């Protein structure tokens, strides 16, 4: 299909792209990825279309041509660490110095739009901030890559998940709900979101009844735990997987129906959507982003997947060797996906600080010396780039600031839908004569403790008077 | 200087001795314990070449690099794994590729061997870590060559359930810092804890405050909270979880709040720490006992110490240990000895992968991956221990809990029982000097129908 090949072109700046295009020792080999995943291919074209698209504006980068490097990295960090490596090694030049600091090193791509997963955000951000090479990264959304001490160039176009968490803790908060109990995935995810949930609730007043790590396929015990405690409101900060073992328990179990505060993990995956005998397992209420969409983007992938078949244009013109022997039926599965948007914003961020930091104007751009990578992190913080006509800003710690919207689970003959019941953009802000709950009539369920007349709670809070 | 001697095979070394503008490492305050344990390496080093038996006509070299507790991980790493010139090429097979050292002894803080083994991993160069206790270490596929000469957090742990069982506490606190090692401990602690029909009163969480600075009021308030919490418990023996160092300021409020009589369970951070105990004032506020690892005397080496490109040098270090050499003498061994069998490990890997015996070896070219493979199979006997890694890169050596005893004179830390590993039981437990009227052993119960979520109540 002559797709893999068009994974790199050439520019005055090359940028830099770090995506799961692939999927899964004795002797320091690279492992090599066969299987191919459509949601990096997806990503990888959404980043391409951005830099295209941004080659053809005149009023942004004139007069200059913008590259990338699009590299393959599954999950594991040992296949990205090798594309990182490159990417600082000296434009031209097959190796990467020794030097004492970031100042002696020439990298030969600006910037990289790093990884998708967070830990693989934390390995490459700290691989980075050495060089001081400035890296954006979508969909890595765990909370301690915004620290500034130890990743000085690391910046990200999704919200952290203390957005998120604080936006729950509002939502506990204002419902009345002070008695709960917090629940995580055993992975480092779950357990990031339960140290940050466990300082926000005990600043807003909310105690923690129980606080348990939940198994990704022990559950029982945890289901125990959260039974023993008269808590009708269960926070789930967990993955896909640990979410929907933990449902599959609790509806064999006939557990309670309870309040489920729902991450963004598992508030509209289809795999626990519709596992069957849900709708008697209380409402799930939870934050989902409140973000744009690439409307062009389907008819982007089918006209270049269209295009790749012709011979001429592949003889004008491996990463992914797994990436020729495809069709459109294999990626148009995840066509509207929402990580899409996260990258070709990415993109117009790196544009939009190359512009600054060449101080282009709109008629053409003065000529000077190639800046280095490290020269981009100064405009790159305070910065304001627009995606799509919609402004958005880079924070002092490298976060992107978005509104999200609160939603929840309605039923209607087993199909569950979403529904705007609020909205958080720092203040949380509810409409609750529209929420539908499960109690036995439209009454909000009680999740109640006496802060004031026998301790109780995992942080010795409340009072059972 | 000391941070470099030139050899047949080199070794590196990372140790603690301590956005445009990127602060070195010289300029924070000196932290001794590296030192020593830089010293300890390098006596190891000398006493091999010095011994005609192990590597014989080898020159061992090394060079060690002065590495931060989480600042500076990487340039250290590209500068062993880079040539003589300063080049580390970029290729997708490594089998053939000669680094500058064929082992690294590793840094001490579990973040910073994870940052290290994470590069490392693409060339399985063997790295050898003392004093990292992360369980997460333990994953030979995270990272395939990552070597451990202490035992995890696990065996910690393991001593701390099983001295709260011997003295029958089933009533404890667990105060945790914000950092993931108090998390990750506490978490372990409470998980192992929850089967063995002991309860946790409750769990908090102290904030992030390193000594020498000015300290906001918001922390002063949760830690008034917390040890008004404390004071209102009624279970009287307290676990910390915390960095050595920001356990000072909420030291102060247990004493200006004047709360007394409480058992103190300290994890490996803070129980050997000579610096806190030179506080000197917290012996009202009960007993403090510490797990640790056991007291190896290496025959030779407090004399030797006594005796003597970037991040590579360090001035105040000698100075900051003159005055702590009297108490670190008295304290004996404890993660030396981790850096002395990590060396001499390394050591006869590479004796046994040469093939030499009692004779000029081959003096044979050397991949890291060749000598992490060897590297499994040692086993030696070093100063009456027997030293062999786990299926998981471990070596089981004895742990200690340890109990302060305000004495210059004698042992400051004088050990009262003995961990062993590999059957994961503490016996050989002697007497304890306890803070109660009569030295009766301190009693933790919630309970001389059950109330609340506790099993341990009713
Ligand atoms: C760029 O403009 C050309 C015409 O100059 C057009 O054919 C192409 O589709 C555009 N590409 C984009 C918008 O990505
Ligand atoms: C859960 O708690 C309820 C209410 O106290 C109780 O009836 C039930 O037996 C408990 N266990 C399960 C498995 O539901
Ligand atoms: C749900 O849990 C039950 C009870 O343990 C188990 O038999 C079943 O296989 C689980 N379902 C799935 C889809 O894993
Ligand atoms: C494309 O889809 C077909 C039909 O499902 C599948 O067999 C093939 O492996 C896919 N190609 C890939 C994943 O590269
Ligand atoms: C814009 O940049 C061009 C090219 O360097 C320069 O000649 C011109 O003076 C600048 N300003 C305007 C207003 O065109
Ligand atoms: C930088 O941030 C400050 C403080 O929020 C703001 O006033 C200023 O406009 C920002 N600068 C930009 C967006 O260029
Ligand atoms: C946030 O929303 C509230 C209403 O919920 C509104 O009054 C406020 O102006 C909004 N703030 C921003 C910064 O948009
Ligand atoms: C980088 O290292 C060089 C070594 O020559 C030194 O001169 C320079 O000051 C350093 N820059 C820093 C620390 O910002
Ligand atoms: C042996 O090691 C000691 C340190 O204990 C050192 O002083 C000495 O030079 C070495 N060689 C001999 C021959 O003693
Ligand atoms: C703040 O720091 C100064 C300077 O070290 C010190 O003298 C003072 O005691 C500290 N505290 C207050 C409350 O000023
Ligand atoms: C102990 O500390 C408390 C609390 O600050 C203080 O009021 C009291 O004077 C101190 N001394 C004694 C002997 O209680
Ligand atoms: C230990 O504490 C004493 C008493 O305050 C102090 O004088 C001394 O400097 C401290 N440090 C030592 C002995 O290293
Ligand atoms: C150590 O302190 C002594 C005085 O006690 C001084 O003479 C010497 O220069 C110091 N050494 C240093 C600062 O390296
Ligand atoms: C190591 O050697 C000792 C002494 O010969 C032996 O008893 C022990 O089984 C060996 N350990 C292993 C793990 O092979
Ligand atoms: C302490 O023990 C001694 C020795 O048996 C006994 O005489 C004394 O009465 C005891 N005191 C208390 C307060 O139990």
């Known amino acids: 299909l002559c797709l893999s090949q068009q994974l790199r072109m050439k520019g005055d700046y090359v940028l830099g792209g770090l995506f799961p295009l692939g999927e899964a020792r004795t002797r320091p080999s690279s492992p090599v990825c066969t299987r191919f995943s459509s949601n990096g291919l997806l990503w990888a074209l959404a980043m391409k279309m951005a830099v295209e698209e941004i080659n053809n504006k005149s009023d942004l980068l004139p007069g200059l041509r913008l590259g990338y490097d699009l590299f393959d990295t599954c999950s594991e960090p040992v296949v990205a660490m090798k594309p990182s490596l490159m990417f600082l090694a000296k434009a031209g030049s097959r190796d990467i110095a020794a030097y004492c600091n970031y100042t002696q090193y020439q990298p030969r791509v600006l910037a990289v739009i790093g990884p998708h997963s967070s830990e693989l955000a934390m390995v490459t951000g700290k691989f980075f901030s050495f060089f001081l090479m400035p890296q954006v990264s979508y969909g890595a959304s765990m909370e301690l890559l915004s620290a500034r001490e130890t990743f000085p160039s690391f910046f990200r176009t999704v919200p952290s998940d203390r957005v998120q968490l604080t936006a729950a803790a509002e939502l506990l908060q204002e419902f009345g709900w002070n008695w709960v109990a917090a629940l995580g995935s055993d992975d480092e995810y779950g357990r990031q979101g339960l140290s940050i949930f466990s300082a926000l609730a005990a600043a807003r007043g909310i105690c923690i009844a129980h606080e348990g790590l939940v198994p990704l396929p022990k559950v029982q015990d945890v289901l125990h735990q959260v039974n023993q405690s008269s808590v009708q409101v269960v926070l789930l900060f967990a993955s896909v997987h640990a979410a929907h073992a933990l449902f599959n328990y609790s509806i064999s179990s006939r557990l309670s129906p309870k309040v489920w505060v729902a991450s963004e993990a598992w508030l509209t995956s289809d795999l626990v959507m519709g596992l069957p005998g849900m709708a008697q397992m209380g409402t799930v209420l939870g934050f989902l982003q409140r973000g744009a969409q690439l409307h062009e983007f389907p008819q982007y992938v089918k006209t270049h997947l269209a295009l790749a078949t012709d011979p001429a244009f592949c003889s004008a013109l491996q990463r992914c060797p797994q990436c020729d022997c495809i069709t459109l039926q294999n990626v148009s599965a995840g066509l509207n996906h929402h990580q899409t948007f996260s990258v070709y914003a990415a993109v117009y961020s790196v544009a939009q600080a190359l512009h600054n930091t060449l101080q282009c104007n709109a008629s053409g751009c003065p000529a000077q010396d190639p800046v280095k990578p490290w020269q981009l992190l100064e405009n790159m913080y305070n910065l304001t780039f627009h995606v799509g006509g919609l402004p958005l800003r880079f924070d002092s710690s490298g976060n992107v600031d978005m509104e999200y919207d609160l939603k929840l689970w309605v039923w209607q003959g087993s199909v569950p839908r979403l529904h705007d019941v609020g909205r958080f953009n720092g203040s949380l802000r509810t409409e609750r004569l529209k929420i539908r709950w499960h109690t036995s009539d439209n009454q909000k369920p009680v999740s109640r403790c006496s802060r004031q007349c026998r301790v109780k709670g995992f942080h010795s809070c409340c009072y059972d008077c | 200087s000391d941070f470099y001697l030139p050899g047949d095979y080199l070794l590196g070394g990372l140790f603690s001795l301590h956005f445009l503008q990127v602060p070195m490492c010289k300029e924070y305050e000196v932290k001794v314990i590296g030192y020593n344990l830089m010293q300890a390496m390098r006596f190891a080093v000398e006493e091999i070449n010095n011994d005609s038996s192990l590597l014989p006509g080898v020159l061992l070299g090394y ?154 009021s918001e922390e002063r308030q949760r830690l008034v909270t917390i040890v008004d919490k404390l004071q209102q418990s009624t279970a009287r023996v307290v676990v910390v979880f915390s960095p050595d160092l920001t356990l000072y300021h909420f030291f102060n409020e247990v004493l200006r709040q004047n709360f007394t009589g409480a058992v103190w369970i300290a994890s490996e951070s803070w129980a050997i720490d000579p610096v806190l105990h030179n506080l000197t004032e917290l012996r009202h506020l009960g007993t403090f006992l510490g797990i640790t690892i056991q007291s190896v005397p290496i025959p030779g080496f407090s004399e030797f110490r006594e005796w003597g490109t970037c991040n590579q040098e360090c001035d105040n270090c000698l100075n900051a240990t003159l005055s702590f050499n009297t108490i670190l003498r008295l304290s004996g061994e404890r993660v030396v000895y981790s850096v002395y069998s990590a060396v001499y490990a ?60 305000w004495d210059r004179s004698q042992n400051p830390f004088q050990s009262v029982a003995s961990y062993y590993p590999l059957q994961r039981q503490l016996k050989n437990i002697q007497d304890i000097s306890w803070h109660t009227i009569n030295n009766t052993i301190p009693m933790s119960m919630c309970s001389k129908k059950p109330v609340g979520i506790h099993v341990c109540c009713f």
Request: hydrophobic fraction near 45%; glycine fraction near 2%.
């Open chain 2, 63 to 216: 060079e060690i690099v002065d590495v931060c507790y989480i600042s500076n991980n990487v340039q250290p790493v590209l500068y062993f794994l880079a040539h003589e010139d300063n080049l580390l090429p970029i290729q997708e097979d490594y089998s053939n590729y000669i680094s500058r050292v064929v082992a690294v002894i590793g840094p001490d803080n579990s973040e910073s061997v994870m940052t290290v083994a994470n590069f490392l991993s693409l060339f399985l160069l063997p790295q050898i870590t003392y004093s990292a206790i992360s369980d997460e270490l333990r994953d030979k596929v995270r990272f395939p060559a990552l070597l451990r000469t202490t035992p995890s957090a696990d065996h910690h742990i393991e001593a701390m359930v099983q001295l709260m069982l011997h003295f029958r506490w089933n009533w404890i606190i667990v105060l945790v810092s914000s950092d993931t090692y108090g998390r990750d401990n506490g978490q372990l602690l409470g998980e192992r804890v929850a089967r063995r029909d002991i309860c946790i009163a409750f769990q908090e969480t102290l904030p992030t405050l390193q000594p020498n600075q000015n300290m906001t």
């Open chain 2, 346 to 405: 390394v050591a006869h890997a590479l004796h046994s992968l040469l093939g030499c015996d009692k004779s000029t070896c081959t003096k044979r070219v050397v991949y890291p991956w060749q000598l992490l493979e060897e590297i499994w199979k040692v086993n030696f006997t070093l100063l009456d221990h027997q030293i062999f890694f786990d299926p998981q890169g471990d070596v089981a050596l004895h742990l200690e809990i340890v109990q302060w005893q």
